[PDB]
Scaffold this motif. Structure first.
Motif, PDB file in Angstrom:
ATOM      1  N   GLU A 156       1.388   5.393  80.719  1.00 48.01           N
ATOM      2  CA  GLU A 156       2.602   6.184  80.561  1.00 48.01           C
ATOM      3  C   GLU A 156       3.775   5.565  81.301  1.00 48.01           C
ATOM      4  O   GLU A 156       4.920   5.672  80.852  1.00 48.01           O
ATOM      5  CB  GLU A 156       2.383   7.609  81.067  1.00 48.01           C
ATOM      6  CG  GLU A 156       1.175   8.317  80.487  1.00 48.01           C
ATOM      7  CD  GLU A 156       1.399   8.829  79.083  1.00 48.01           C
ATOM      8  OE1 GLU A 156       2.532   8.706  78.573  1.00 48.01           O
ATOM      9  OE2 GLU A 156       0.438   9.357  78.486  1.00 48.01           O
ATOM     10  N   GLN A 157       3.503   4.923  82.434  1.00 51.40           N
ATOM     11  CA  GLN A 157       4.553   4.258  83.193  1.00 51.40           C
ATOM     12  C   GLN A 157       5.194   3.147  82.378  1.00 51.40           C
ATOM     13  O   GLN A 157       6.418   2.978  82.397  1.00 51.40           O
ATOM     14  CB  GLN A 157       3.960   3.716  84.492  1.00 51.40           C
ATOM     15  CG  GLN A 157       4.867   2.837  85.329  1.00 51.40           C
ATOM     16  CD  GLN A 157       4.085   2.004  86.323  1.00 51.40           C
ATOM     17  OE1 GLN A 157       3.295   1.144  85.938  1.00 51.40           O
ATOM     18  NE2 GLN A 157       4.291   2.260  87.607  1.00 51.40           N
ATOM     19  N   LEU A 182      -3.635  -2.281  90.764  1.00 49.04           N
ATOM     20  CA  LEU A 182      -3.418  -0.900  90.358  1.00 49.04           C
ATOM     21  C   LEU A 182      -2.217  -0.276  91.049  1.00 49.04           C
ATOM     22  O   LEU A 182      -1.703   0.739  90.571  1.00 49.04           O
ATOM     23  CB  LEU A 182      -4.676  -0.081  90.638  1.00 49.04           C
ATOM     24  CG  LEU A 182      -4.721   1.358  90.136  1.00 49.04           C
ATOM     25  CD1 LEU A 182      -4.482   1.422  88.645  1.00 49.04           C
ATOM     26  CD2 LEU A 182      -6.059   1.977  90.488  1.00 49.04           C
ATOM     27  N   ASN A 204       3.814  -2.051  90.309  1.00 50.76           N
ATOM     28  CA  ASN A 204       4.529  -1.400  89.218  1.00 50.76           C
ATOM     29  C   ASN A 204       4.509  -2.310  87.997  1.00 50.76           C
ATOM     30  O   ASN A 204       5.130  -3.378  87.997  1.00 50.76           O
ATOM     31  CB  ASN A 204       5.958  -1.079  89.639  1.00 50.76           C
ATOM     32  CG  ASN A 204       6.791  -0.543  88.499  1.00 50.76           C
ATOM     33  OD1 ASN A 204       6.263   0.023  87.544  1.00 50.76           O
ATOM     34  ND2 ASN A 204       8.100  -0.719  88.591  1.00 50.76           N
ATOM     35  N   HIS A 219      -4.433   6.191  82.098  1.00 52.37           N
ATOM     36  CA  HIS A 219      -3.287   6.869  81.504  1.00 52.37           C
ATOM     37  C   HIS A 219      -2.048   6.827  82.386  1.00 52.37           C
ATOM     38  O   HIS A 219      -0.955   6.588  81.849  1.00 52.37           O
ATOM     39  CB  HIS A 219      -3.666   8.315  81.164  1.00 52.37           C
ATOM     40  CG  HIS A 219      -4.593   8.436  79.998  1.00 52.37           C
ATOM     41  ND1 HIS A 219      -4.879   9.639  79.395  1.00 52.37           N
ATOM     42  CD2 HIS A 219      -5.298   7.499  79.321  1.00 52.37           C
ATOM     43  CE1 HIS A 219      -5.721   9.441  78.399  1.00 52.37           C
ATOM     44  NE2 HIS A 219      -5.990   8.151  78.332  1.00 52.37           N
ATOM     45  N   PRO A 220      -2.128   7.037  83.701  1.00 52.95           N
ATOM     46  CA  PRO A 220      -0.902   6.943  84.509  1.00 52.95           C
ATOM     47  C   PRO A 220      -0.182   5.619  84.349  1.00 52.95           C
ATOM     48  O   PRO A 220       1.052   5.592  84.293  1.00 52.95           O
ATOM     49  CB  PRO A 220      -1.416   7.148  85.937  1.00 52.95           C
ATOM     50  CG  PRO A 220      -2.667   7.919  85.781  1.00 52.95           C
ATOM     51  CD  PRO A 220      -3.286   7.447  84.508  1.00 52.95           C
ATOM     52  N   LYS A 221      -0.919   4.513  84.263  1.00 51.90           N
ATOM     53  CA  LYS A 221      -0.275   3.219  84.078  1.00 51.90           C
ATOM     54  C   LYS A 221       0.248   3.062  82.655  1.00 51.90           C
ATOM     55  O   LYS A 221       1.316   2.477  82.442  1.00 51.90           O
ATOM     56  CB  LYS A 221      -1.252   2.099  84.427  1.00 51.90           C
ATOM     57  CG  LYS A 221      -1.895   2.230  85.802  1.00 51.90           C
ATOM     58  CD  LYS A 221      -0.875   2.193  86.928  1.00 51.90           C
ATOM     59  CE  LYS A 221      -0.233   0.834  87.065  1.00 51.90           C
ATOM     60  NZ  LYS A 221       0.694   0.770  88.218  1.00 51.90           N
ATOM     61  N   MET A 252       4.966  10.148  85.557  1.00 54.26           N
ATOM     62  CA  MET A 252       4.242  10.591  86.746  1.00 54.26           C
ATOM     63  C   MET A 252       4.193   9.453  87.762  1.00 54.26           C
ATOM     64  O   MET A 252       4.499   8.301  87.451  1.00 54.26           O
ATOM     65  CB  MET A 252       2.825  11.046  86.391  1.00 54.26           C
ATOM     66  CG  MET A 252       1.975   9.943  85.797  1.00 54.26           C
ATOM     67  SD  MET A 252       0.307  10.466  85.379  1.00 54.26           S
ATOM     68  CE  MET A 252       0.474  10.695  83.614  1.00 54.26           C
ATOM     69  N   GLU A 282       5.715  -1.626  84.953  1.00 52.61           N
ATOM     70  CA  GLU A 282       6.879  -1.514  84.076  1.00 52.61           C
ATOM     71  C   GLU A 282       7.877  -2.637  84.320  1.00 52.61           C
ATOM     72  O   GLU A 282       8.447  -3.186  83.370  1.00 52.61           O
ATOM     73  CB  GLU A 282       7.552  -0.156  84.263  1.00 52.61           C
ATOM     74  CG  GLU A 282       8.880  -0.033  83.529  1.00 52.61           C
ATOM     75  CD  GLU A 282       9.457   1.369  83.555  1.00 52.61           C
ATOM     76  OE1 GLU A 282       8.785   2.290  84.067  1.00 52.61           O
ATOM     77  OE2 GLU A 282      10.589   1.550  83.060  1.00 52.61           O
ATOM     78  N   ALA A 330       2.623   6.582  89.639  1.00 47.79           N
ATOM     79  CA  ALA A 330       1.609   5.611  89.226  1.00 47.79           C
ATOM     80  C   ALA A 330       1.904   4.241  89.824  1.00 47.79           C
ATOM     81  O   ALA A 330       3.051   3.925  90.139  1.00 47.79           O
ATOM     82  CB  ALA A 330       1.539   5.521  87.706  1.00 47.79           C
TER      83      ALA A 330
END
Ligand SMILES: CCCCCCCCCCCCCCCCCC(=O)OC[C@H](COP(=O)([O-])OCC[N+](C)(C)C)OC(=O)CCCCCCCCCCCCCCCCC
Ligand SMILES: CCCCCCCCCCCCCCCCCC(=O)OC[C@H](COP(=O)([O-])OCC[N+](C)(C)C)OC(=O)CCCCCCCCCCCCCCCCC
Ligand SMILES: *Cc1cc2c(cc1C)nc1c(=O)[nH]c(=O)nc-1n2C[C@H](O)[C@H](O)[C@H](O)COP(=O)(O)OP(=O)(O)OC[C@H]1O[C@@H](n2cnc3c(N)ncnc32)[C@H](O)[C@@H]1O
Ligand SMILES: CCCCCCCC/C=C\CCCCCCCC(=O)OC[C@H](COP(=O)(O)OCCN)OC(=O)CCCCCCC/C=C\CCCCCCCC
Ligand SMILES: CCCCCCCC/C=C\CCCCCCCC(=O)OC[C@H](COP(=O)(O)OCCN)OC(=O)CCCCCCC/C=C\CCCCCCCC
Ligand SMILES: COC1=C(OC)C(=O)C(CC=C(C)C)=C(C)C1=O
Ligand code: SF4
Ligand code: F3S
Ligand code: FES
Ligand SMILES: [K+]
Lengths: 164, 259, 48, 604, 86, 82
Positions: free
Chosen positions: A138-139, A24, A27, A134-136, B257, A29, B259
């Motif tokens: 969106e990343q 978690l 990164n 959601h944070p992941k 954000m 992305e 993350a």
């Protein structure tokens, strides 16, 4: 799993929590982060599952395992969509040609308006399937769709929250 | 009678962008480049499109590429000569129309660093300003003046190649501004997040960001300091710290954000 | 109905600073060393 | 969403609140509404950090008491005197009593204020500020952040909006308000300059946080984006605008660039000299020579140049000498002025004087508002009647905190206080979750038709030529010292420029970043507000604050202590007349914590 | 598009000025080390008349002058070879 | 060109589509396998390489220094070059 190693419940809890936060926290992305790490994550995840099988109903270990499984599911799903977006953007870049001149340019995606409708649907499906990630999402996928938006003008729900 | 070649693109015709040459009498024009562009639009070709607000260099909206080097048109001086003055959009940016770039990625990346003060304890009732010494305030001197013109961003060869993975000079300097603000209490969290190969270590010290900065700031020096601080302060537990903060942002809305 | 344009590579026109040319000479240092070794190897094999 | 009105793609949004503007006032209002749990959108023509609030230099006034002993009530008395007893004392009390809290909140979100030796916020002296209700000396209430107090505030308020996750519609030019037949705002109708689509935002409560209309003059300190778009929208909705005759000329603006030199320069020791080398400001406003009210200083400078004691080859400007001050203080407290002078004037502050001249800076007029930031539609029986669904904040609004003359470092305070108040007021009206607004059936029809008519405009006059004509008339017919004859001439001229907008023509017919079209729509807003300014000024036969008639050189409290309300008769600028009505000023403070400051002489 | 002050043209001249000198020296040192070995293994030795030299060689080495094909490789180079070499 | 429009994206860790990220992981394994194999080149050189002037060296040790203990009188000029 085929192993003779024995671990206490405290050791099992520690290994599972370490893997959960490791995944978690990484990164998603950056593709090289997942490509290099997933082989180590899969070897560890097999060992964690074997030693945590007794504690699936445990009040502490059980929740950690469930979150760990959900995170891995979200990691694989998000990586897939962003991989396709990376394919679309690299097709677009090759279409620009050498030096941007257009000299030796590849042919340019023709169903790009429709390929952007496919990705946005997938993005929304991920958001529903993985509401606690959601944070992941969106990343990786969200930012990917923002990059595509700079090439093709399409509409998605969160477009305004990405400055479009 | 100076000659000004200007980049032109119609988003509707979608015809290959081209440079159109205009002739302007500098006697009836302001010293700055932006004055020439306004005069061209007012008199010759009103179709010309460009962003401009402050006229004094403070809004950071007139960032363009003049004769090769990025800069703000309102602070740039017209340099008369036989050679046409070439004005183009910001380098390697998607052109919405004529000289108006598409800086949406730059805005998103900035939102990612979460540039707002974070404290572990909410201001207790009956509390005044958070204490900061003059010396501490001096640390944030050259970093809080950034007008987000995005010149340093579109001058970095590393942002040209990996725009969607490298945060870029301006965002990185802003991250150091919040890592250097004595009042902020999430120093370790910010350093852990920024400690990524793509986000930070894509800076190779080209120094184009510092050379083109219209406000005379030094983004290159700030990135070097931030890399030294991270290297000295790294701990094995940083990855867990990033994960825990990511859990804290679970209920946030859909946008870039931490993350 | 509207599409944005992608500007060409900035390398062809962006102004060059002395710190940017010298940073390249540093990143190309190992590339030159391999090249020289290859030349010497080729000469030791196809000359005199 | 997806619809098709008059061939245009119309998207529909249904929020609980919409804020037009992402400047100081707009960013604060949005963050507040989101913090109250209300679904909200914030529309802006530019990225929020590029608004004119960023160009502010001086600071924000608060009775923090970090430099000397202070009371908010003293700040309140100063504002009443500065307003020349035209500002509402109700709103002034609300703003002054909240100034300490608002400034500390801004620091709590990270505003990089300059610091004292004890770690507190540094406060600088500004004009029109005193202690002990005028019986004391200069008051250091202007919490500044070097010469960049705007950049600081706007960036910090953007950060706060990011923290609260505010939905932003960036680069969307608002066209009109979606008014109901009953007379209630139901939202706004905007266009995207990046996609070319029309959007119909439907909200229960709308907040107009646009800026002023300072670009209606030839020489201004305002941004090119300062066209007063929210005032035009209100005027085209049939609602009144107020105190448009009170236009503030800042005493020091770089000559002829029109840039602004902070009043803090004088507040830190700067002296204004003339051709005779005299600090002439002692003759006018003797007790506070250079730190007098901005209206007194400007009139003094204009008279001096008029008397022949002007500096320069053309003897056309005045000199500001900061050279005598320490170089460290210049570098530490006035870091930005020095560079701007070096560029736009070619002056070395530490060794040379800076050429300066009075320049239009702020507009005390705007949408009539109450102390809760609710826009007003006064009626003969209800001077305090409020538009049901509309609110205003910032330079766009006229709660009359500033009255006839604004005190330096009070506008940035009005941005934060009234943006916050507007969010509180909506919270009480609109609940966090509410059934969606019912946009009227013909919502936008007229706006779309006008937009299309202007898009396909092929008339003889050009937008730029018409704008230059208007800017010239305003600069020449409404100067620092106005006379009735010129005001009449100008009033005829602006009416002609109004009927000339029917001949404007644009060459670009696209919808993506069509600056030609956007600038023509802006000229409509500029014309209507500039017209109402000249009409209101000619009608006011007195000399109060910034309005200085040579014909009538004295305040008339008996017959002219009134707010001046202007109305555009018809929605089309080329088919309308400027009607003028009046509404009384609120003189009683809202609580007993502050007393009524009786009308008196304003000598300074 | 193309400019002399471009990052490309100024990074290509800088690289040439910086590396070509280093490289020329480096390759030259290798070439010098090659000559040092060559001159110690078979130093070029100049003879006046090729015909007389060839005779002394055949006499010294006991080679039948009839079985040795003498050919002129270059204006300043002759070469004796075995004619009955597989 | 054109691109497929009916892609079944991965839904979880046990229902996965073959993508270029998985191909990149196979590349990582294959490149790393090459590294393991190429280590056999330098390891083989060190093991099989001998630095001896002639076949005499071993005969000298068998007949004069069999125990690797015999001491030779040292004449410095021999190997000092002077
Ligand atoms: C994880 C395992 C990876 C294995 C990958 C594949 C093999 C990798 C081999 C690596 C070593 C290679 C060395 C160079 C090549 C050698 C070739 C050779 O000559 O071999 C014969 C020779 C033997 O000499 P020899 O003379 O008999 O034969 C060589 C013949 N001549 C002289 C003609 C060349 O091997 C060596 O001398 C190498 C000895 C290596 C000893 C290493 C000791 C390691 C100690 C580690 C301790 C760690 C403690 C950790 C404690 C933790 C507590 C928490
Ligand atoms: C116990 C105390 C510990 C102290 C530790 C201090 C360590 C640091 C000091 C340096 C030690 C290294 C010495 C080099 C190795 C021995 C030399 C050798 O074998 O040559 C003799 C050999 C001897 O061979 P020989 O056949 O000529 O010997 C016979 C000699 N006669 C004919 C007179 C009888 O030299 C040669 O063959 C000629 C070529 C020599 C080329 C040397 C190149 C330099 C190599 C080192 C590079 C270091 C790089 C780092 C520096 C960065 C530079 C930019
Ligand atoms: C001009 C000026 C003012 C000023 C100052 C220095 C200068 C040069 N220094 C000040 C100071 O030191 N201390 C102080 O107290 N005040 C000072 N001021 C005054 C203040 O900065 C201005 O009055 C300011 O404009 C007030 O802020 P506000 O929020 O009301 O307005 P804004 O910053 O101009 O931004 C308005 C926003 O609205 C958007 N907009 C405009 N039209 C539209 C349309 N049609 N559609 C959508 N959005 C719109 C603008 O884009 C902007 O975001
Ligand atoms: C821009 C910069 C330009 C620079 C240009 C100049 C750069 C180069 C300068 C000149 C460098 C010259 C180096 C010469 C090295 C020659 C050394 C040499 O001959 O090594 C072999 C040498 C002995 O030679 P032989 O007598 O032929 O014996 C054969 C076996 N019986 O062998 C050794 O002992 C080598 C020892 C190496 C030890 C290293 C560790 C293993
Ligand atoms: C500013 C300039 C600074 C220069 C400093 C010195 C730089 C040195 C650079 C070294 C590059 C890498 C060399 C690799 C090791 C080779 C060592 C060497 O001398 O090689 C020959 C050396 C000696 O050979 P002998 O067996 O004694 O006789 C045969 C003669 N040909 O043999 C080896 O060790 C070969 C090793 C091969 C694998 C490497
Ligand atoms: C615009 O065309 C090009 C790119 O796309 C941005 C490149 O990535 C790069 C950068 C890659 C290398 C190997 C320097 C070049 C040179 C290029 O021509
Ligand atoms: S660092 Fe300089 S160039 Fe970059 S955004 Fe800030 S002011 Fe502009
Ligand atoms: S130009 Fe780029 S590589 Fe670094 S020094 Fe500046 S951010
Ligand atoms: S117009 Fe604002 S930076 Fe130039
Ligand atoms: K800190």
């Amino acid at each position: 799993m085929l192993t003779v190693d024995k671990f206490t419940r405290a050791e099992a809890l520690q290994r599972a929590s370490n893997l959960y936060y490791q995944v978690l926290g990484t990164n998603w992305e950056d593709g090289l982060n997942l490509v290099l790490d997933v082989p180590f994550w899969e070897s560890e995840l097999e060992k964690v599952d074997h030693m945590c099988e007794p504690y699936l109903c445990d009040d502490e270990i059980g929740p950690i395992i469930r979150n760990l499984h959900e995170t891995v599911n979200c990691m694989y799903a998000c990586e897939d969509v962003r991989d396709h977006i990376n394919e679309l953007l690299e097709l677009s870049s090759r279409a620009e040609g050498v030096m941007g001149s257009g000299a030796a340019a590849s042919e340019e995606v023709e169903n790009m308006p429709e390929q952007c409708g496919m990705v946005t649907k997938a993005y929304e499906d991920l958001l529903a399937r993985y509401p606690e990630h959601h944070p992941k999402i969106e990343q990786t996928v969200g930012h990917g769709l923002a990059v595509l938006r700079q090439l093709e003008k399409f509409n998605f729900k969160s477009s305004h929250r990405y400055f479009f | 009678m100076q000659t000004f070649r200007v980049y032109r693109y119609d988003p509707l015709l979608q015809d290959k962008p081209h440079m159109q040459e205009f002739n302007i009498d500098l006697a009836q024009c302001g010293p700055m480049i932006l004055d020439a562009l306004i005069k061209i639009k007012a008199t010759q070709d009103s179709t010309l499109a460009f962003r401009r607000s402050c006229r004094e260099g403070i809004c950071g909206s007139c960032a363009m590429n003049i004769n090769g080097k990025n800069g703000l048109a309102c602070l740039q001086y017209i340099e008369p000569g036989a050679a046409p003055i070439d004005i183009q959009p910001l380098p390697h940016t998607y052109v919405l129309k004529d000289l108006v770039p598409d800086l949406s990625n730059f805005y998103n990346q900035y939102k990612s660093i979460e540039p707002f003060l974070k404290r572990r304890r909410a201001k207790q009732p009956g509390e005044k300003e958070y204490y900061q010494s003059i010396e501490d305030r001096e640390k944030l001197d050259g970093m809080y003046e950034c007008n987000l013109c995005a010149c340093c961003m579109t001058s970095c060869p590393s942002y040209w190649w990996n725009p969607e993975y490298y945060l870029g000079p301006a965002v990185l300097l802003q991250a150091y501004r919040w890592i250097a603000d004595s009042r902020d209490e999430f120093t370790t969290e910010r350093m852990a997040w920024i400690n990524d190969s793509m986000r930070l270590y894509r800076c190779h010290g080209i120094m184009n960001c510092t050379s083109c900065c219209p406000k005379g700031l030094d983004p290159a020096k700030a990135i070097a300091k931030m890399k030294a601080a991270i290297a000295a302060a790294y701990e094995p537990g940083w990855t867990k710290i990033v994960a825990q903060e990511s859990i804290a942002n679970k209920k946030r809305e859909s946008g870039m954000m931490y993350a | 109905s509207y599409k944005s344009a992608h500007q060409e590579t900035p390398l062809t026109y962006y102004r060059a600073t002395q710190h940017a040319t010298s940073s390249i000479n540093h990143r190309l240092a190992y590339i030159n060393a391999v090249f020289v070794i290859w030349v010497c190897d080729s000469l030791n094999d196809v000359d005199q | 969403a997806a619809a098709a009105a008059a061939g245009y793609a119309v998207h529909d949004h249904f929020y609980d609140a919409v804020v037009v503007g992402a400047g100081g006032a707009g960013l604060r209002a949005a963050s507040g509404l989101v913090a109250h749990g209300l679904k909200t959108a914030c529309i802006s023509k530019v990225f929020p950090t590029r608004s004119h609030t960023v160009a502010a230099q001086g600071g924000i006034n608060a009775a923090l008491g970090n430099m000397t002993e202070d009371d908010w009530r003293w700040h309140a008395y100063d504002t009443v005197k500065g307003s020349d007893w035209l500002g509402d004392q109700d709103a002034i009390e609300h703003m002054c009593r909240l100034a300490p809290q608002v400034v500390l909140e801004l620091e709590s979100y990270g505003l990089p204020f300059s610091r004292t030796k004890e770690g507190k916020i540094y406060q600088r002296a500004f004009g029109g500020q005193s202690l002990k209700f005028g019986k004391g000396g200069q008051a250091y209430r202007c919490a500044a952040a070097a010469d960049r107090t705007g950049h600081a505030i706007l960036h910090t308020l953007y950060g706060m909006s990011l923290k609260y996750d505010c939905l932003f519609f960036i680069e969307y030019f608002a066209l009109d308000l979606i008014m109901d037949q009953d007379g209630s705002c139901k939202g706004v109708i905007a266009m995207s300059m990046e996609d070319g689509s029309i959007h119909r935002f439907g909200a229960h409560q709308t907040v107009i946080a646009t800026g002023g209309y300072g670009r209606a003059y030839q020489s201004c300190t305002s941004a090119h984006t300062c066209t007063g778009d929210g005032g035009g929208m209100v005027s085209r909705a049939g609602l009144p605008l107020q105190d448009l005759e009170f236009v503030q000329f800042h005493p020091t603006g770089i000559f002829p660039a029109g840039c602004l030199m902070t009043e803090g320069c004088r507040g830190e020791g700067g002296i204004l000299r003339n051709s005779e080398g005299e600090p002439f400001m002692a003759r006018y406003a003797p007790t506070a020579k250079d730190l007098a009210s901005r209206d007194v200083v400007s009139r003094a400078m204009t008279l001096e140049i008029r008397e022949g004691r002007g500096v320069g080859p053309n003897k056309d400007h005045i000199y500001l000498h900061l050279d005598h001050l320490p170089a460290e203080t210049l570098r530490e407290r006035l870091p930005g002025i020095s560079e701007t002078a070096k560029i736009f004037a070619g002056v070395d502050v530490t060794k040379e004087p800076i050429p300066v001249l009075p320049t239009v800076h702020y507009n005390m007029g705007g949408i009539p508002t109450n102390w809760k930031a609710q826009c007003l539609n006064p009626t003969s029986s209800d001077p305090n009647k409020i538009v049901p669904g509309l609110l205003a904040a910032g330079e766009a609004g006229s709660a009359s905190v500033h009255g006839a003359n604004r005190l330096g470092a009070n506008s940035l305070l009005d941005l934060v206080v009234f943006g916050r108040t507007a969010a509180d007021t909506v919270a009480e009206i609109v609940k966090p979750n509410s059934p969606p607004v019912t946009l009227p059936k013909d919502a936008g029809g007229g706006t779309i038709d006008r937009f299309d008519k202007i898009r396909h405009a092929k008339g003889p006059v050009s937008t730029a030529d018409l704008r230059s004509k208007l800017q010239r008339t305003m600069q020449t017919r409404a100067p620092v010292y106005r006379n009735g004859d010129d005001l009449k001439k100008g009033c005829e001229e602006v009416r002609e420029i109004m009927k000339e907008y029917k001949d404007v023509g644009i060459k670009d017919r696209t919808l993506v970043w069509n600056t030609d079209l956007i600038e023509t729509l802006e000229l409509e807003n500029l014309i209507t507000q500039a017209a109402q300014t000249i009409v209101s000024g000619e009608a006011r036969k007195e000399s109060r604050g910034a309005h200085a008639r040579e014909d009538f050189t004295e305040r008339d409290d008996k017959k002219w202590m009134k707010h001046s309300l202007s109305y555009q008769t018809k929605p089309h600028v080329e088919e309308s007349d400027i009607v003028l009505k009046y509404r009384p000023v609120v003189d009683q403070p809202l609580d007993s914590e502050m007393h009524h400051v009786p009308p008196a002489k304003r000598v300074y | 598009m193309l400019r002399y002050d471009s990052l490309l043209w100024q990074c290509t001249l800088a690289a040439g000025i910086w590396f070509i000198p280093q490289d020329v020296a480096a390759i030259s040192a290798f070439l010098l080390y090659g000559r040092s070995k060559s001159r110690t293994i078979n130093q070029p030795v100049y003879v006046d008349n090729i015909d007389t030299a060839a005779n002394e060689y055949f006499k010294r080495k006991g080679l039948d002058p009839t079985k040795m094909i003498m050919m002129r490789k270059s204006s300043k180079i002759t070469e004796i070879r075995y004619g009955e070499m597989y | 060109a054109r691109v497929p429009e009916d892609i079944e994206f991965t839904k979880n860790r046990y229902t996965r589509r073959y993508n270029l990220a998985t191909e990149d992981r196979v590349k990582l394994l294959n490149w790393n396998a090459f590294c393991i194999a190429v280590t056999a080149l330098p390891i083989a050189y060190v093991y099989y390489s001998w630095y001896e002037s002639s076949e005499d060296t071993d005969m000298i040790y068998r007949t004069m220094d069999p125990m690797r203990e015999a001491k030779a009188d040292y004449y410095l000029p021999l190997l000092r070059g002077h």
